[PDB]
Amino acid sequence: SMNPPPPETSNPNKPKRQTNQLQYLLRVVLKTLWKHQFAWPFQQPVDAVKLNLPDYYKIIKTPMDMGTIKKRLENNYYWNAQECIQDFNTMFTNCYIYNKPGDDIVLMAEALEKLFLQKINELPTEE
């Protein structure tokens, strides 16, 4: 039933960088998905209490959301692009794991993920 602490967005002893790929992940990828009409369910951690989903964090053991990704990018939390790409993929995968095909939230994730794929196809070469 209860919500877990959200994923961390700050960790001072975690090494981090600001690469051109991570800049693109913020300025292009996150920005594109964030403004989308279907972004809102994904702009913050799942509130299992308010949404009345008491089994959500029994099923989903690696939660992720764009609110978290946004703060991680703004805070330069990542070492490399792959870490951030993995967070997006975790977010999408969690949605598909928890819900059933054709649910509204799945259609919404599919729309965002199509755009995600189109943008990472154009990920720049590093440096």
Ligand X SMILES: O=C1CCCN1c1cccc(NS(=O)(=O)c2cc(Br)ccc2Br)c1
Q: Which residues bind ligand X (CB under 6 A)?
A: 41-42, 46, 51, 53, 95, 98-99, 104-105, 108
CB 57 within 8 A of CB 1: no
Rounded to a whole number of angstroms, the minimum distance from the CB of residue 82 to ligand X is 23
CB 110 within 8 A of CB 44: no
- Which of residues 55 and 126 has its CB atom nearest to ligand X in the complex? 55
Q: Number of helices (H) and strands (E), helices first, in the chain?
A: 6, 0
Identify the three-state secondary structure at position 12.
coil
Rounded to a whole number of angstroms, the minimum distance from the CB of residue 74 to ligand X is 21
Rounded to a whole number of angstroms, the minimum distance from the CB of residue 24 to ligand X is 25
- Alpha-carbon 22 to chain mean position: 14
- Which of residues 64 and 81 has its CB atom nearest to ligand X in the complex? 64
Asked whether the CA dihedral 8, 14, 19, 21 is positive or negative, the reply is: negative
- Which of residues 22 and 88 has its CB atom nearest to ligand X in the complex? 88
Rounded to a whole number of angstroms, the minimum distance from the CB of residue 38 to ligand X is 8
- Which of residues 32 and 99 has its CB atom nearest to ligand X in the complex? 99
CB 70 within 8 A of CB 39: no
Amino acid identity at 127:
E
